[PDB]
């Protein structure tokens, strides 16, 4: 397969920038999250698997699922969570194969969502971490959900401790720095792996 770089962190923290940046470098981005979406849409099969399992409850308006209620529920419930792995984990895991058998560029990014699972990317050459400073978090996070710092606070209290990350990761990038510096570290990270790539079999 292609060489494939598994993109983590959270969004607060400017994963989703990084991203970007890697595409401008013409790299392919394959978003995990957006495939899960696209998997769980309205009247497609995992859809209907959801709704059978949770009920009218996690329906909208819409006829689209509440996912912010999913998410609580699997929070507190790992019964429920490990259900939901169990459905979506295979179906993803194909949609990004199919990604990469059609890969145009020297290398894959595959930005995976905040809960990292690794053991169901044993694909993955390098895993790139993006972390920033506690105050940018709460700042991006307070403008991008209008909520309160200390509301904010309690969004990032619930997240995964990043020791595991940190430890699990081959490069962590940390903005701390504006748009221009994070741009010049995925630049020379970009060089990392198209270097790597080349060398290793």
Request: glycine letters at 4%; charged letters at 25%; one cysteine or more.
């Amino acid at each position: 397969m292609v060489y494939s770089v598994g993109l983590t962190g959270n969004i607060a923290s400017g994963k989703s920038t990084v991203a970007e940046f890697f595409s401008e470098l013409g790299i392919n981005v394959i978003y995990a999250d957006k495939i899960a979406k696209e998997l769980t849409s309205k009247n497609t099969p995992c859809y209907q698997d959801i709704i059978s399992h949770f009920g009218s409850s996690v329906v909208l308006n819409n006829g689209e699922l509440d996912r912010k209620r999913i998410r609580d529920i699997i929070f507190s419930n790992s019964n429920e969570r490990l259900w939901l792995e169990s459905l979506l984990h295979p179906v993803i895991r194909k949609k990004i194969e199919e990604q990469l058998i059609v890969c145009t560029s020297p290398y894959c990014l595959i930005e995976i969502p905040l809960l990292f699972n690794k053991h169901h990317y044993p694909y993955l050459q390098k895993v790139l971490l993006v972390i920033a400073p506690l105050e940018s978090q709460l700042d991006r996070i307070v403008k991008r959900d209008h909520c309160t710092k200390k509301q904010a606070l309690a969004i990032l209290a619930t997240q995964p401790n990043l020791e595991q990350r940190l430890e699990a990761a081959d490069d962590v990038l940390i903005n701390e720095s504006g748009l221009s510096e994070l741009k010049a570290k995925v630049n020379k990270l970009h060089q990392k792996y198209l270097r790597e790539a080349k060398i290793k079999q």
